[PDB]
Amino acid sequence: EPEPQMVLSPLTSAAIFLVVTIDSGGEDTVRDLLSDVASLERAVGFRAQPDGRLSCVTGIGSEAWDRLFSGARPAGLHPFRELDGPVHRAVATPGDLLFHIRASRLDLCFALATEIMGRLRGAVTPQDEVHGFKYFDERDMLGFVDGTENPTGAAARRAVLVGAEDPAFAGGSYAVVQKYLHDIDAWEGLSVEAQERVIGRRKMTDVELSDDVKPADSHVALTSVTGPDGSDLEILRDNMPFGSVGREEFGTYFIGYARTPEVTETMLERMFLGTASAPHDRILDFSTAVTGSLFFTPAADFLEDL
Amino acid sequence: EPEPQMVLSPLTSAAIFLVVTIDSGGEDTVRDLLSDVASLERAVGFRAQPDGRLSCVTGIGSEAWDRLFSGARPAGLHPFRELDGPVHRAVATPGDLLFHIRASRLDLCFALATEIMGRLRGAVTPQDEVHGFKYFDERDMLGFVDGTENPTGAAARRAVLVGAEDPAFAGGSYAVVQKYLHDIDAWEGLSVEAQERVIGRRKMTDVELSDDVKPADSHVALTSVTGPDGSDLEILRDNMPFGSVGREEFGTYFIGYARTPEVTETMLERMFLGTASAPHDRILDFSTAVTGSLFFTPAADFLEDLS
Amino acid sequence: EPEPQMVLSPLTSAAIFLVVTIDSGGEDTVRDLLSDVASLERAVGFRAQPDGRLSCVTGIGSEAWDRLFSGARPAGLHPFRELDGPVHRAVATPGDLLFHIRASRLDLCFALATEIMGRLRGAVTPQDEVHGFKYFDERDMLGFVDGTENPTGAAARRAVLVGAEDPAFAGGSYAVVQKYLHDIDAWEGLSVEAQERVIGRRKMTDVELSDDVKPADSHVALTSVTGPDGSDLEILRDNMPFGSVGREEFGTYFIGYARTPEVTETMLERMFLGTASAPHDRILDFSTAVTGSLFFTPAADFLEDL
Amino acid sequence: PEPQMVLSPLTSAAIFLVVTIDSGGEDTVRDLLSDVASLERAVGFRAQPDGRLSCVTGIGSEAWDRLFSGARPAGLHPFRELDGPVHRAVATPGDLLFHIRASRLDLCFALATEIMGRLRGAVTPQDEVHGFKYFDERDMLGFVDGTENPTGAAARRAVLVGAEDPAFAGGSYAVVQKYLHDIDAWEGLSVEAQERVIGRRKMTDVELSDDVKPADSHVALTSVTGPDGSDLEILRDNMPFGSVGREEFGTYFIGYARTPEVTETMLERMFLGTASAPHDRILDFSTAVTGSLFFTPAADFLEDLS
Amino acid sequence: EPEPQMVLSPLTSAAIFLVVTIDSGGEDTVRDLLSDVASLERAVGFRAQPDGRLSCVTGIGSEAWDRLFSGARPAGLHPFRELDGPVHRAVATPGDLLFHIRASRLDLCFALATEIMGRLRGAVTPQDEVHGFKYFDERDMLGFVDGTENPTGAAARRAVLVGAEDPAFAGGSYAVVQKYLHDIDAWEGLSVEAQERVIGRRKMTDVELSDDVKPADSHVALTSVTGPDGSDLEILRDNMPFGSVGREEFGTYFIGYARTPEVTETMLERMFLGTASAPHDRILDFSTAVTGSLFFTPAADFLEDL
Amino acid sequence: PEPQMVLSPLTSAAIFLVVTIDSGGEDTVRDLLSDVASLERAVGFRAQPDGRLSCVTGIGSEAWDRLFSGARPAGLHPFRELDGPVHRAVATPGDLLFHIRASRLDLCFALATEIMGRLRGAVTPQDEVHGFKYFDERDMLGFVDGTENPTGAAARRAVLVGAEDPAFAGGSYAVVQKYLHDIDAWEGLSVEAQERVIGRRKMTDVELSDDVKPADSHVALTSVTGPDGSDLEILRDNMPFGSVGREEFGTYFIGYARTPEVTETMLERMFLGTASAPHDRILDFSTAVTGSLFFTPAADFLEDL
């Protein structure tokens, strides 16, 4: 019975996202970091029992995997597929390792990040670093409650964790990350009612719009995906707001976990390429992806056997 | 199937450790209590839900077991084995009943302890009583984070709970207790770096030392045990600080839980007797054990059925 | 595999109890809501993660069930049985739908209640609405700690959830509600020791009286029932104080969950009708039931599949 | 002299209790008034330091002459009924006001119990409201309520009677109105329209610019400059309350001021209007069902009733 | 006007009381500590801003004062007066320095006590050390809420702080300490109503007994003292429960602050010697004093200039 | 004379915002200044219980003359650059300071959004820092930071402008410096060596005895007795900030005082040193990147625009 990383953990009030690439000859340094990552996690985490809720999820990219490990590959691991839509593009950017660090306070996140990057100095190049913060009652930079429909319990376990379809990597998951910057000026130009028709939910109360009123080009409509089975295909999102007031940056840092990248990729295609009913997701008219990467987050015990 | 006691429950900010012996003719009263202990826990505990976190783990010693129950004995149940090392000594002291009381508040611990002792008045003799308190960011009296490498989840479950190896006592655990008093004067005479080498971890940050910087006689080295399997042998520790400023008492109350005492004893033998590589555990140069007892903590439904 | 409602979750500091009857023609509106109740819960509840502890348990009465659905019914689903004792009486009052709404904050309960009633407006008539609040250290309005002997963990699941004895409704539960009013004047006429003999537990410390001192007509003695096989018959209770000072109204809202109504009813019967050694439960000399209803709380998946 | 907790901040729970003194009740009421502070401590000390239990006792105009023989507060008179063209501010009976606040309802209820237990047979209850915090300090209209309350020294100058009436220094005047809202009508308005009624942004609580702020907006009409140029200010401890089944969604208004003239001017502008505005637009969705004026003496006035 | 020590500070959930005698020739070491004690307080305390609430009050005994300082003495400073009543006795025990350490956490108290004693090592002998803890809803070991009638605000200031009557020591206070052990067995043999007549207040509710039911030999009767002008003489109490279950020690650590010892001593005389109306205080029938010391707690700036 | 929230304690989160006023932006700025308190209330009241939202507004010396006519605060001047032998205290541009504090970063960010939203196209951002509490009130050097801050009346007397400048009573002077730390170098030192640099014990925060404390320790050099004989004090609201990837581990220094002379004397002893000390030893591990001086007026001053 394999132990997964904290991919099922709930959202926290603080987060750090680290994306790095592995320099020439950096493999060895990276390998024995990976073996110590859980150790470093407890070293910092235990200081803030019991309300700390510190966790680190480590992801490894497609290219990076081959450099680090001989043997089998996760069945679904590949580079993030750039999507060049008629209007909006989902860019792909470099990234070998992901560190998704969460806690109830930023100090814990920062302390852990410091230890991780301290061990990696001279072996990696930083691509992206984001300090996410909770924004009021679980809102995003668009002013909407964000994460409502995340699966819970058994439903989440079956949606997120690799199982018998790839037995060797069971307990693992696939993370997709995209850094989105928002055009607040354009968004603020819309009425609340217009904004609601973009998302597919009521702004203040977070109640889902009726099927009668919900536009087919609304975010909720596009990202509702039914399989050939007839079952709802779900991902687990741990999105965090970030930004800088002076540089006029108001951002959503998207991260989605699923047992297969196909699920996430299908949703991305519907958003960026569109469907029969919608040219594209209307949220992208106010959101611009600036990064895009895909990582496999292995079971905890896989990392510990290095 | 069987329901364990709160032996897996996490560390709290307040604790009471109570160790008593059973007087001759006190058996009836003791059994009578043991069957009511869980209901006493609820009586006090329910008042302070949801953030009370009151729990009581009840342990029974080897000698006490024979006096108390006729029937099968837990396989690993034996009295604490005293260790006479060349320098340091792990003493064995009397103790028939263990009450490990934890809560987020001392009052809850005190109230429960009062109800238990009220019932045991003329049947038990108190041997030890410690009031434990959280010290800053989970520090011990030596100034180091304490409990870091405790197992969690399924790993904790395998390491602590008696399973199929002893079916009639499935859900049980073994608790070894030792009250240590520290020589703070000698300790604060060392530099931080020297203190780190004694422990095997950085002081401020709690980051484990590199394997080729970590001495063979450091606490972490000697308490790192690998079995014939190749797997790590783990115990679950609920150490609490305690002490009196006026009496120059600065202490660590040691309590380790494991599915078999053989694990704790191996670690204990390595600390006191040493290995090929190490004479003894350097931590013992600033720590004196003044008590030493071993208890079996039965599954909850074992206590309840005593009736 | 069937997912239950939050019937096993603990006491919270705030609760709203809502009982309604379905107006003629309201059936369709009611069915549509039942399928969205879980969705409304998440919508409101997610805003207050993770300290919110918002839950809703929906129950359906015997007569309501026959109006809403066709096919098989839960084995034990019947209207509340009136108990006409020599002295005290347990009355049966109308109620088709129970909404048991709990949270750590009243605002959360009220918001959810608003959303539910908003969608039921003109289809249902309200029968009872009670806003419960925690009173000191889990005390009821009689000044005694209330809920101590509730089952926990496995025993709770055993006592509360329908299993193999009614396989088509596994994961369901039966909820009996009764609104009690206390005569505080009469109660305060008693000494503490006398009140203790009524309940069967110490007032301040909540320690149970020993078997020699505990009277046969005490509340604890009468509600202690062993089955034919010697096993204890248990229910899960989520009682909440309520009241109005100006009206001199001091109440306990009784709600008890059990896998079969036979367990709860045996307790009612012993209370109101008495035993061989007790004419009735002494607590009833200071407590008057002004409502009485029985509901079946289906498994969650039952509701969403409407 | 020592004032009552009239400057004390808003809490998450409140009980408002308004009663009339029955004939022959004067002596029982006088006894209570002397003990009210000690009852407040008896209950309150149990929940230090996060209890924040306080009780402000107010006395009506008619009640004052019945109770006291000496001088009267200069500003004390019965609430003036305002009969405007469209909207009416009713004057309703009320001799004593108990404004009870704490961080938890149980504390409020406990104190109210003790107070009414002593007043039974001497007083008749007129009104009882149990108020609760609603999200981020919102009212039932969904707007942040209390923003412009004076703080620090400004509050002291606005609320506390001073040298203008030296024998009652440390006192204050409290106006209470119970408002019920028409939530159906209100939710028929767009957010932008609702903002026009109130005079501030809904979600962000930012005041509308002076160029866009309607003259009949709530904020416009309750902004009153004195003949000296500076703004008249009152301290508002409004609480939401209600009952879902009965479609009762309410704001319990209570305003403190060093003279009623301030509060009455403000009320006149709302009900009667200015040259540029017929009446307050908030009143198109809000109906006042009670109206009472009370003087809240300095604490030492109450206890020196020995 | 000088800075007082935290003698007006509220009750906390944790406390360490530390009483020592100064060894022969240990005066210089003591003087050095006294001048650094505020630094030590801030050194430890700042780590737990802002919920730590760490404070230290330093008291100096009568005999110790002469050994430490030359010149003026506080007017009311003398050794504790032993009271040998007919039945009960208040013993005088040695004490030169008192450290009254409070915080919301024991760890902060222990840390500070460590630093203090670390400096005093070899210059003092410890006489008494007690670790106090909050017991439920501000209760003592007798099960009664303890500290209800403590003065607050300007009343506390007037009752506690030395003023113009001794201007050289303005801002100082006098502390009386007594360690009491309770006979819980005997006390738990009384009915609640008997216990109430001993204390003079209701047990659960903490409401004071009316003046026609309250016995003359009750605690509240004998400790209620009216002064020349007819107003109550008051002290500030920071009582903390303590004890050891094994040794059957259930204790109250009594500490009372007053601007003059004469107030506390009057109360003690009434309690121990009795009046014409009362043989002695009934609380003494269940409580034995084992220590008894009197200290002057000088203004903070007195300690600093040393 | 109602002052700004300058006597207010440390919070878990902070945003420091320094801007320059673009040419012809005077009017827009003056208008914001009159509304800043109402914007603070608008956001702050939402979390009324325990939000602890505050905003202190500061105005630079050159900015003052562009905005207001008449009386100038006596001690208001541009930040004096100090070019020492080894270390340099740089002066950088800054017209407006917004010192925003709350118990939550969201509150800070929202207020900053509203402030900056109103100032768009009238100001140029110079610096933005998101500060966060680090464990038990520690800085990036691992030391408890702010211990010897004055409290109560001592704080009020040390920080608030009084009779010496009656036109601006209830004001204060704020000095800001963004420091970056050489963590590699710092963590090479032993704890004992670190303690000699600071002048206090690392873990316990206990001050070293006067006989073991080096003359070039931070604590020794910043301890200044005035010509009057009493200790000179400032109120520090230092916050850690940083970025792990960039290798940025910083202390945002902000100190409030009745007169800038007090703060400047300390700076002088740190960068230039004394007879017995070359410079503050903390500076061998700390580089100042910004340096600005602002006057923070009384609250009522801002309202009467």
Ligand code: HEM
């Ligand atoms: C003198 C009293 C003791 C003190 C102050 C002490 C303190 C510590 C500290 C600071 C650590 C490192 C942090 C952690 O992982 O918890 C540690 C680790 C540990 N201690 Fe102790 N300890 C004491 C006695 C014991 C005893 C008697 C045992 C059992 C025989 C024990 C077993 C362990 C184990 C198993 C670890 C984890 C080692 C690892 O896997 O890294 N300790 N202890």
Ligand code: HEM
């Ligand atoms: C008048 C309203 C009622 C009040 C105020 C009340 C109060 C209490 C109290 C104080 C206790 C002891 C503490 C505990 O909860 O374990 C108790 C126990 C209990 N009550 Fe009630 N009760 C009421 C009505 C009922 C009803 C109607 C039932 C069943 C239909 C019931 C079933 C129980 C059960 C099963 C126990 C646990 C007995 C045990 O095993 O010790 N109660 N109740």
Ligand code: HEM
């Ligand atoms: C119908 C019930 C009422 C509701 C729901 C209500 C709601 C509000 C709201 C949302 C605000 C703006 C935010 C704030 O500053 O608090 C406000 C402001 C205010 N209200 Fe009301 N209000 C009501 C009745 C009254 C009454 C009866 C008075 C006095 C007679 C009053 C006096 C004020 C004042 C003075 C302000 C602040 C004006 C300023 O910006 O300077 N309100 N109220």
Ligand code: HEM
């Ligand atoms: C044996 C240890 C003691 C216990 C358990 C105890 C307990 C109590 C209790 C329960 C109260 C009523 C609630 C309150 O206002 O605090 C009280 C009141 C009081 N006690 Fe004590 N007390 C003790 C010793 C003393 C001593 C030695 C003194 C005086 C030297 C004292 C002075 C007072 C005073 C002045 C009051 C307030 C009476 C009033 O004005 O209503 N107590 N105490």
